[PDB]
């Protein structure tokens, strides 16, 4: 947490930092996107 | 089995209208405070849905699948136990059956023998099916507890299901909220996705009976079956990620 690093999450790639999400999300949700076709939220499959 | 009872008769297709309802999440993608435009099979705004009722008679026509399935039901004691999903409606092909005993929902694809209007008491099979063979597919859902006994007062159960088949994938969109002409706007959530991959051209319904062959007396319930149509909606998302408003593109 709180470091700019490379991401590999389930085949998807990105670069950024990890902060705690306070928004209420679906329990069946794998990921979510932004205003473009770009990411914000990922799910860690081992520990949720 | 082959003997038609009192509740099997020819009745006319009375209809009703719907305005707000029929809006589901097209995907699991979270979008916040934006208007998303997507194209999927949707229930159209200002449409005609076919109204069904049961009081000495029961409505079970054989309805084709290919215009889509929209289900909504306003009930007390949860009369509808599931559906029959098939093509030629015999043992020559595969058929899907949903059995809800209000413990664990049994979902199987197997070769069954079908009647015109199958009955349920506990459960009775057959009339639903007499015998079965040649299936490797079994599915076990999550256990729960519901009340099948009768209740009083206001109508406490609203079950809204959207059933569709896209590229051999069967999806169940489930929403339950407390509530002949309903109102209110809601957003449906997905539940069970099974990649079965069968051709379903027609569908039927199921009925649970009670007794204080023909001595089993049906209860009082109402539901309606809608159709879908490739359209475009605009979905209004809040900060919590729910749909508070839906605007059709062309109506």
From Swiss-Prot, chain A:
- What name appears for this protein in its UniProt entry? Spike protein S1
What gene name is given for the protein in this entry? Answer: S
Q: How does it assemble?
A: Binds to host ACE2. RBD also interacts with the N-linked glycan on 'Asn-90' of ACE2. Cleavage of S generates a polybasic C-terminal sequence on S1 that binds to host Neuropilin-1 (NRP1) and Neuropilin-2 (NRP2) receptors. Interacts with host integrin alpha-5/beta-1 (ITGA5:ITGB1) and with ACE2 in complex with integrin alpha-5/beta-1 (ITGA5:ITGB1). May interact via cytoplasmic c-terminus with M protein. May interact (via N-terminus) with host bilirubin and biliverdin, thereby preventing antibody binding to the SARS-CoV-2 spike NTD via an allosteric mechanism.
Q: What does this protein do?
A: Attaches the virion to the cell membrane by interacting with host receptor, initiating the infection. The major receptor is host ACE2. When S2/S2' has been cleaved, binding to the receptor triggers direct fusion at the cell membrane. When S2/S2' has not been cleaved, binding to the receptor results in internalization of the virus by endocytosis using host TFRC and GRM2 and leading to fusion of the virion membrane with the host endosomal membrane. Alternatively, may use NRP1/NRP2 and integrin as entry receptors.
Q: In which domain of life is the source organism classified?
A: Viruses
């Amino acid at each position: 947490k709180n470091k700019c690093v490379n991401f590999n999450f389930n085949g998807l790639k990105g670069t950024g930092v990890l902060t705690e999400s306070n928004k209420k999300f679906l329990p069946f949700q794998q990921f979510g996107r932004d205003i473009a076709d770009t990411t914000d939220a990922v799910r860690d499959p081992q520990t949720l | 089995q082959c003997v038609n009872l009192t509740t099997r008769t020819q009745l006319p297709p009375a209809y009703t209208n719907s305005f707000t309802r029929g809006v589901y999440y097209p995907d699991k993608v979270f979008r916040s405070s934006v208007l998303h435009s997507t194209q999927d099979l949707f229930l159209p705004f200002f449409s005609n849905v076919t109204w069904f009722h049961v009081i000495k008679r029961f409505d079970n026509p054989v309805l084709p699948f290919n215009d889509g399935v929209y289900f909504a039901s306003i009930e007390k004691s949860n009369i509808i136990r599931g559906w029959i999903f098939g093509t030629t409606l015999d043992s020559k092909t595969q058929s899907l059956l949903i059995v809800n005993n209000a413990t664990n929902v049994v979902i199987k694809v197997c070769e069954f023998q079908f009647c015109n209007d199958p009955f349920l008491d506990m459960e009775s099979e057959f009339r639903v099916y007499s015998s079965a063979n040649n299936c490797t597919f079994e599915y076990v859902s999550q256990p729960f507890l519901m009340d099948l006994e009768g209740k009083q007062g206001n109508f406490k159960n609203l079950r809204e299901f959207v059933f569709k088949n896209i590229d051999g994938y069967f999806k169940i969109y489930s929403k339950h909220t407390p509530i002949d002409l309903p109102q209110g706007f809601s957003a449906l959530e997905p539940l069970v996705d099974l990649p079965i991959g069968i051709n379903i051209t027609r569908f039927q319904t199921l009925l649970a009976l009670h007794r204080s062959s023909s001595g089993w007396t049906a209860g009082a319930a109402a539901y309606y079956v809608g159709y879908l149509q490739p359209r475009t909606f605009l979905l209004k998302y809040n900060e919590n990620g729910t749909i508070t408003d839906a605007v059709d593109c062309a109506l």
